[PDB]
Amino acid sequence: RFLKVKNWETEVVLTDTLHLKSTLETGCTEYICMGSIMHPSDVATKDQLFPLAKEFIDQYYSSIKRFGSKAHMERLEEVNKEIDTTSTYQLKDTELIYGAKHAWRNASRCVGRIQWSKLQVFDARDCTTAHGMFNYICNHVKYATNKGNLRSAITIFPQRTDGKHDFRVWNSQLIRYAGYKQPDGSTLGDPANVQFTEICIQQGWKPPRGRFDVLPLLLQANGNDPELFQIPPELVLEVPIRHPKFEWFKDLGLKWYGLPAVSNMLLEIGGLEFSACPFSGWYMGTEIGVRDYCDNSRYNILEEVAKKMNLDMRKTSSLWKDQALVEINIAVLYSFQSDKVTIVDHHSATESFIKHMENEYRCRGGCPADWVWIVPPMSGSITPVFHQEMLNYRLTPSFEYQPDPWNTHVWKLV
Amino acid sequence: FLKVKNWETEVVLTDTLHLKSTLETGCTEYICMGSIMHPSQHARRPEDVATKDQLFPLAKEFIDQYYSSIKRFGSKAHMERLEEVNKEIDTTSTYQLKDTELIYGAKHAWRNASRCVGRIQWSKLQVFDARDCTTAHGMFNYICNHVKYATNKGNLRSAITIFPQRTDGKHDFRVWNSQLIRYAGYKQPDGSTLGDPANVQFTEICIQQGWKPPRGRFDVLPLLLQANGNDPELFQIPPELVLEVPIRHPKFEWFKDLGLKWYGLPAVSNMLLEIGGLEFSACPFSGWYMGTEIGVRDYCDNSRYNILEEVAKKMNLDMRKTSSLWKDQALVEINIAVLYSFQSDKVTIVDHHSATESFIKHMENEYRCRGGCPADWVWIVPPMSGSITPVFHQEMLNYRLTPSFEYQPDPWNTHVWK
Ligand code: HEM
Ligand code: HEM
Ligand SMILES: CNCc1cc(Cl)cc(-c2cc(C)cc(N)n2)c1
Ligand SMILES: CNCc1cc(Cl)cc(-c2cc(C)cc(N)n2)c1
Ligand SMILES: C[C@H](O)[C@H](O)[C@H]1CNc2nc(N)[nH]c(=O)c2N1
Ligand SMILES: C[C@H](O)[C@H](O)[C@H]1CNc2nc(N)[nH]c(=O)c2N1
Ligand SMILES: [Zn+2]
């Protein structure tokens, strides 16, 4: 079978055969679509692991044009021995690199995947303690930041065993700003991080209580209680936000960090689960300018910017929010570019994604894509992805969500 | 039961209405087709004149639903109605709706339209019964009355006009226009396009049918009307019935020199209304605009009027690189002008902030009284400034309830001319 997707702007039609490889569920049924549900739908047994491992080893040997080779058959035999004797198995370095790159390639919600094959993979599977994790993460940050010429990277800590010895980075990103609830109901800093900030403070962090305090790392090795570490400040690259035309914009006191580094997801490769796998790229400007700065639940700066713009805020139909939103996003891009910190605007990023998508259809037979996430949160229809039909399905290796660790960890101290 | 969450407010709604869904969405548990324009060809009755065992179950389902809606399930009138529909199908292979059922069906087709952000208004719909029409001249009369009623000198009123249902598929009533009022598009000698590029093909059909085009940028197209399966006929809508808004900007005095205008009445005329197995192939309906339909899509789509270049030039923006966001900046100004112009001329219009807020309220109402509200996030979220509207943060479930509005093929792809 085949499925066709059409671009209603260009009338290009692409044919998807890759969807026949789909494994896990989307969340939809034949009579209900759940495409706008954010999170739809203890550890694998010996019998469950065998076919998952085979499927992955088969796809790896096919990608390197060695399917059916003597090395392919011996790897399957070796993997089967380990599952039989140890209830798990260990990836080769080549397989780990392949798996991590393809999990990115398969991330239907990621607009930056034209870069998927250029990923630096740091193997941290020899790590045993939270101090070791800190070292690996510091090296990752320094490598990826590269004095502003950002480089994509992932660091992979030991896989889950019995579920009682998980490695976890408790932070949602490696670098984020604290949030502090005030007695009067206001919030200082980032409201999204209020709960995690409370956890850090309880664990002994002495907070500066400012608007842009970089959070400490909360690292868990081998199922033990997590431990606090301060990222060396010289490793944290930040960009002060100014505007090319409004001299008053710098007086807002805004800044942001250069390195987006997601640290709470799970990497699944051949049935193995890597619960600590922080990965990083570079920003699309709207992530900061639209969501981080203008979500009502985040820094929520629309009103202040519109005030300083002298906009008429008495009625929605003046589009004062829309006008301020654009200027904020001009400032974000101008500031990063001025400081020579890698960033991509939503027009360039979506254009490249269409190129990537078309390439993937030609060479791979498809490209799973989540329109709801791919379309940028402003100016949707003036980007080419708005007009692009997409098919969403789940391929493995994959990045997956997992519960926040504070909701499942059983503590040990005192 | 299924839950949807709003990630801004943390409001959670619980959906049970989806248990009544009738048609496939196109998705499976392994593939989601939520961004496909036409994901499914699943129809409730086959291509044309159904046999009795194909039509009667659908009729019974709808009559059951209607008599349930008025607390008369199993009543004397319900059972007589079933026997009456049974005889009509036995003797004519179809049946005729009562006026009350027709009004109920049209309002519930709107209520069930998962792509429509305007549905808080669903029960305020004026229904014009045009099922006695026999000629394209009569269709023109019905459509003119609809336009005048709905326009109401700028105080727009929602309305639908319903022409005779399909019988054998050879006697179809069709409005060939996609909307009752649209602008012509013309292929220019050098290769460019004058007017609306979306309508170039339809414009050519009209010209080929004898229409004399004034060949400007905003020429209101004639009506191309098909009655009882015959060849379609051209009619000029009386210009005094076509309300238009010249577009100006509250700050930029040069904006009016761009020479832009638009019409006030959005009137979809190419969809099919499906009620109890009956297919009404000509059912023009109209409401009022959300400003982004004109200011974002009509004006700024690359394959429509494509005016971003012009506007940004007059604003003296840096058009050298995408990262200056000159497209985004001009886009906001255009949408400010559209709203300011309609409002200045007292022509009903809603902005995307007010419309999306109203739709969230409508969802909550529907979950409270009906147990659900089918909604297509991809269509409901406006095409600019998405995440600063509340619908962006609202999870939605999409499913297909009947009665409904459906797409149908363009008639020039199927009509065998006489
Ligand atoms: C290289 C530059 C990159 C850019 C410009 C980019 C861009 C983006 C954007 C804008 C999002 C949506 C984020 C949000 O709305 O919260 C996203 C999501 C995502 N990115 Fe990429 N990304 C990049 C690199 C990467 C890398 C290196 C990886 C992994 C190795 C990755 C994996 C993901 C995943 C898994 C998601 C979706 C997470 C989910 O399902 O919630 N991205 N990306
Ligand atoms: C009263 C004011 C109304 C407003 C503000 C409104 C708003 C909208 C908007 C913005 C769209 C998306 C249009 C597009 O992107 O092409 C839409 C679609 C739609 N509307 Fe409404 N609408 C209104 C009234 C109505 C009425 C009276 C009906 C039918 C009786 C209706 C039925 C539909 C349908 C079926 C669609 C989907 C069309 C498709 O799938 O192509 N609407 N509406
Ligand atoms: C939207 N800001 C927070 C956020 C959330 C998520 Cl789920 C992913 C990313 C993300 C990840 C990578 C590797 C690059 C990039 N540009 N963004 C950022
Ligand atoms: C998007 N502009 C063209 C267009 C296309 C479609 Cl499919 C529907 C509507 C539409 C229909 C009604 C009744 C009200 C309204 N505001 N828009 C307009
Ligand atoms: C409810 C809806 O699915 C949710 O708000 C989504 C919409 N699209 C998104 N798209 C991106 N890139 N990031 C997001 O967080 C979201 N949120
Ligand atoms: C491919 C995609 O589904 C298509 O471009 C859709 C996106 N969302 C839309 N939303 C509305 N309201 N109207 C549209 O025409 C579209 N087009
Ligand atoms: Zn779906």
Side-chain angles (χ1 to χ4, degrees):
Chain A
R1 302 143 359 95
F2 308 76
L3 294 169
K4 290 185 186 303
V5 295
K6 170 178 189 176
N7 183 296
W8 290 88
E9 193 198 338
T10 64
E11 299 193 299
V12 167
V13 177
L14 306 173
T15 297
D16 188 298
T17 61
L18 182 63
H19 69 278
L20 303 166
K21 259 62 226 263
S22 295
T23 50
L24 321 151
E25 303 184 316
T26 62
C28 309
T29 75
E30 296 178 321
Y31 291 89
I32 309 137
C33 179
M34 309 207 325
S36 67
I37 302 295
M38 186 111 61
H39 304 298
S41 76
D42 188 47
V43 305
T45 75
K46 267 189 192 178
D47 284 358
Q48 303 175 311
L49 195 50
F50 287 122
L52 299 175
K54 184 186 204 307
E55 220 288 82
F56 169 73
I57 296 296
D58 283 351
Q59 97 166 234
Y60 171 75
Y61 274 89
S62 188
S63 80
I64 68 171
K65 313 309 176 192
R66 294 286 192 281
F67 188 91
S69 63
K70 182 212 275 285
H72 181 190
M73 293 300 114
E74 267 168 20
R75 183 57 180 152
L76 283 177
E77 204 178 26
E78 179 182 46
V79 163
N80 252 235
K81 298 185 222 216
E82 294 199 45
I83 299 174
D84 252 20
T85 56
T86 79
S87 280
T88 191
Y89 69 106
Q90 297 298 322
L91 294 169
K92 308 298 199 195
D93 296 357
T94 52
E95 299 162 354
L96 186 76
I97 294 161
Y98 171 90
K101 291 182 179 183
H102 277 70
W104 185 9
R105 195 186 191 177
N106 295 339
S108 60
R109 287 173 171 180
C110 178
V111 71
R113 283 178 280 169
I114 194 167
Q115 294 279 337
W116 73 268
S117 64
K118 305 180 218 99
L119 177 62
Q120 180 63 39
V121 176
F122 297 115
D123 185 354
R125 287 175 294 174
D126 67 353
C127 192
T128 74
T129 66
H131 279 80
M133 299 180 71
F134 174 69
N135 191 48
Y136 269 113
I137 290 170
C138 285
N139 295 343
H140 177 136
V141 165
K142 189 174 192 169
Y143 171 91
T145 298
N146 190 29
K147 295 187 182 157
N149 180 17
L150 307 188
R151 303 183 282 203
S152 304
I154 183 166
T155 299
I156 299 171
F157 291 106
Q159 63 208 46
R160 177 169 289 160
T161 52
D162 54 9
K164 309 300 208 304
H165 296 82
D166 291 353
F167 285 70
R168 291 295 297 270
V169 178
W170 284 35
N171 308 63
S172 56
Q173 302 175 38
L174 294 186
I175 300 176
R176 277 200 111 170
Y177 296 126
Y180 311 98
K181 197 68 185 290
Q182 308 273 51
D184 69 357
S186 64
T187 303
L188 178 55
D190 191 329
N193 298 319
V194 164
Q195 191 190 8
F196 179 81
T197 299
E198 291 170 346
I199 291 171
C200 294
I201 290 172
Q202 179 174 7
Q203 297 313 123
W205 188 53
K206 315 265 152 283
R209 297 202 152 253
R211 197 170 176 210
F212 297 109
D213 302 338
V214 174
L215 281 157
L217 291 170
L218 229 201
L219 304 183
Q220 164 174 31
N222 205 49
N224 292 314
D225 287 349
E227 306 174 33
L228 288 171
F229 303 90
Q230 179 210 37
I231 303 159
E234 65 269 22
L235 298 187
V236 178
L237 178 61
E238 301 177 293
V239 177
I241 308 302
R242 59 279 198 195
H243 191 278
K245 303 292 172 34
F246 297 143
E247 88 283 352
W248 49 261
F249 203 96
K250 53 169 178 299
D251 309 341
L252 302 173
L254 305 177
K255 63 167 144 177
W256 206 252
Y257 51 89
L259 186 71
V262 166
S263 57
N264 56 0
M265 292 186 82
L266 180 144
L267 168 58
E268 183 206 283
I269 301 169
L272 303 178
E273 301 186 307
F274 297 91
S275 47
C277 60
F279 56 85
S280 68
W282 51 82
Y283 265 117
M284 186 167 74
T286 52
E287 301 178 79
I288 304 167
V290 186
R291 306 298 314 281
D292 296 334
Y293 281 166
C294 301
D295 274 8
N296 282 312
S297 300
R298 298 295 303 289
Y299 277 81
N300 185 32
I301 74 173
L302 279 175
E303 286 197 16
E304 181 173 10
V305 172
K307 278 179 161 73
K308 298 192 77 70
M309 287 175 64
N310 307 314
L311 300 186
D312 168 37
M313 303 171 57
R314 292 180 254 92
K315 51 198 203 162
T316 61
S317 61
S318 79
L319 307 193
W320 62 267
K321 295 188 177 182
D322 314 69
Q323 244 176 344
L325 182 66
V326 173
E327 300 291 1
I328 293 164
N329 276 277
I330 291 172
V332 167
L333 290 164
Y334 171 78
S335 295
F336 271 63
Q337 293 170 349
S338 287
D339 288 355
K340 305 175 91 177
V341 178
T342 308
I343 192 162
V344 67
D345 68 82
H346 53 288
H347 302 289
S348 174
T350 55
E351 180 51 50
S352 295
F353 183 76
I354 293 296
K355 305 279 230 317
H356 170 66
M357 194 179 156
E358 295 178 336
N359 185 44
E360 292 286 82
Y361 269 78
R362 285 195 252 105
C363 82
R364 201 190 188 197
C367 183
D370 187 336
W371 193 101
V372 170
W373 275 61
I374 293 300
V375 178
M378 71 180 289
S379 300
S381 69
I382 63 167
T383 67
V385 287
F386 179 96
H387 307 274
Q388 177 69 53
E389 286 180 354
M390 299 172 189
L391 291 169
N392 198 20
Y393 45 92
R394 183 159 301 279
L395 304 169
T396 180
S398 59
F399 289 109
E400 309 282 353
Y401 299 120
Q402 52 183 334
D404 288 320
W406 49 90
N407 297 326
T408 62
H409 181 72
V410 280
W411 292 81
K412 308 184 173 198
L413 177 53
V414 272
Chain B
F1 77 103
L2 301 167
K3 291 186 187 294
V4 294
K5 174 172 171 175
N6 186 292
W7 288 89
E8 223 186 338
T9 63
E10 304 210 71
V11 173
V12 176
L13 308 169
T14 303
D15 192 293
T16 55
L17 184 63
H18 71 272
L19 303 176
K20 294 242 77 146
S21 79
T22 7
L23 290 315
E24 293 179 351
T25 58
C27 306
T28 75
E29 42 275 62
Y30 296 100
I31 190 151
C32 169
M33 292 191 97
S35 67
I36 307 286
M37 177 77 60
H38 312 296
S40 181
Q41 303 162 82
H42 193 196
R44 271 152 52 80
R45 29 90 37 83
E47 279 172 33
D48 66 318
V49 53
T51 56
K52 187 172 180 186
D53 47 313
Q54 297 167 342
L55 187 57
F56 184 80
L58 305 171
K60 181 173 180 309
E61 171 188 52
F62 169 75
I63 303 292
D64 282 354
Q65 178 188 321
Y66 168 75
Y67 274 91
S68 288
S69 80
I70 66 173
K71 313 301 175 191
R72 296 288 179 274
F73 185 90
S75 64
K76 189 174 304 289
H78 184 185
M79 304 306 297
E80 302 181 7
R81 190 66 182 123
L82 290 176
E83 275 293 341
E84 181 176 32
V85 169
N86 177 79
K87 304 313 190 187
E88 292 186 71
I89 296 181
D90 276 322
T91 55
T92 75
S93 291
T94 193
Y95 70 107
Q96 302 299 316
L97 292 174
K98 304 285 131 154
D99 298 2
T100 53
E101 312 166 340
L102 182 68
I103 296 161
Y104 172 84
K107 293 185 179 179
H108 281 254
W110 185 9
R111 191 192 192 173
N112 293 342
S114 62
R115 289 178 170 173
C116 179
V117 73
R119 280 177 286 164
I120 202 171
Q121 298 276 334
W122 71 269
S123 70
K124 272 204 47 174
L125 175 67
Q126 182 59 35
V127 179
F128 298 116
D129 184 354
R131 291 176 295 165
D132 65 349
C133 197
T134 76
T135 64
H137 275 83
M139 294 178 67
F140 175 66
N141 187 43
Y142 267 112
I143 286 169
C144 285
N145 292 342
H146 177 136
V147 170
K148 192 178 183 165
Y149 174 87
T151 298
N152 190 28
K153 302 183 175 304
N155 185 20
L156 307 188
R157 299 181 281 198
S158 303
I160 184 166
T161 296
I162 304 178
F163 291 107
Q165 63 210 41
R166 173 175 293 152
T167 57
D168 63 353
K170 268 233 181 68
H171 297 77
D172 284 9
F173 285 70
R174 291 295 299 271
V175 182
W176 285 36
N177 313 66
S178 51
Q179 294 174 46
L180 294 184
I181 298 164
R182 288 198 82 178
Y183 296 121
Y186 310 99
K187 210 95 264 306
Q188 294 284 42
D190 37 285
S192 60
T193 301
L194 170 67
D196 192 342
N199 297 320
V200 166
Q201 180 181 29
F202 185 75
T203 302
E204 289 181 3
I205 296 177
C206 291
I207 294 168
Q208 178 249 126
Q209 279 314 103
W211 188 53
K212 297 297 191 276
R215 307 199 63 99
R217 195 173 194 206
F218 302 99
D219 299 335
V220 176
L221 282 159
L223 291 174
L224 231 202
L225 303 186
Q226 171 177 27
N228 205 33
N230 303 303
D231 287 348
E233 305 170 29
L234 288 167
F235 301 86
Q236 180 192 73
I237 303 170
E240 66 268 16
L241 294 192
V242 180
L243 180 45
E244 287 176 305
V245 181
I247 310 291
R248 60 272 197 199
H249 196 279
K251 194 202 313 167
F252 297 147
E253 302 189 339
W254 53 259
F255 200 99
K256 61 173 181 306
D257 303 328
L258 293 164
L260 303 171
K261 59 170 147 185
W262 206 251
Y263 50 90
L265 189 68
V268 174
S269 53
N270 61 353
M271 289 190 81
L272 183 149
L273 166 59
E274 189 272 319
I275 300 169
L278 309 177
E279 303 183 318
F280 297 91
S281 43
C283 57
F285 59 87
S286 59
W288 52 79
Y289 266 116
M290 184 168 73
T292 51
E293 300 180 77
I294 305 162
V296 180
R297 305 295 315 276
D298 293 329
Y299 279 164
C300 297
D301 271 10
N302 289 315
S303 65
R304 301 292 302 289
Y305 277 83
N306 190 28
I307 74 176
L308 282 172
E309 201 101 289
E310 267 267 281
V311 171
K313 274 182 170 59
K314 310 241 166 174
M315 290 174 59
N316 282 287
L317 307 172
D318 186 13
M319 299 171 61
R320 184 178 160 272
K321 51 207 170 64
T322 53
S323 51
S324 71
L325 307 200
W326 65 267
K327 285 190 169 171
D328 314 69
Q329 204 151 41
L331 180 67
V332 173
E333 299 302 338
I334 288 155
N335 280 269
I336 288 179
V338 164
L339 290 164
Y340 169 77
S341 295
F342 273 64
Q343 291 171 353
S344 294
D345 288 357
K346 286 173 163 39
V347 180
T348 307
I349 192 162
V350 61
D351 66 67
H352 54 286
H353 301 296
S354 294
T356 52
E357 178 189 12
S358 296
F359 183 74
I360 293 300
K361 179 74 190 191
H362 174 65
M363 278 187 69
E364 293 172 355
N365 292 342
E366 293 291 74
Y367 272 83
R368 181 186 312 117
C369 73
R370 208 183 184 199
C373 178
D376 184 339
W377 193 98
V378 169
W379 275 64
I380 293 292
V381 175
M384 74 187 271
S385 301
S387 67
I388 59 168
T389 70
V391 292
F392 177 98
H393 308 270
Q394 176 66 61
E395 294 181 343
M396 302 172 186
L397 295 168
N398 196 15
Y399 43 91
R400 304 181 72 188
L401 304 177
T402 183
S404 64
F405 293 108
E406 305 294 340
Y407 303 111
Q408 65 188 320
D410 289 322
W412 52 88
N413 293 337
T414 49
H415 183 72
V416 264
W417 288 70
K418 308 187 193 304

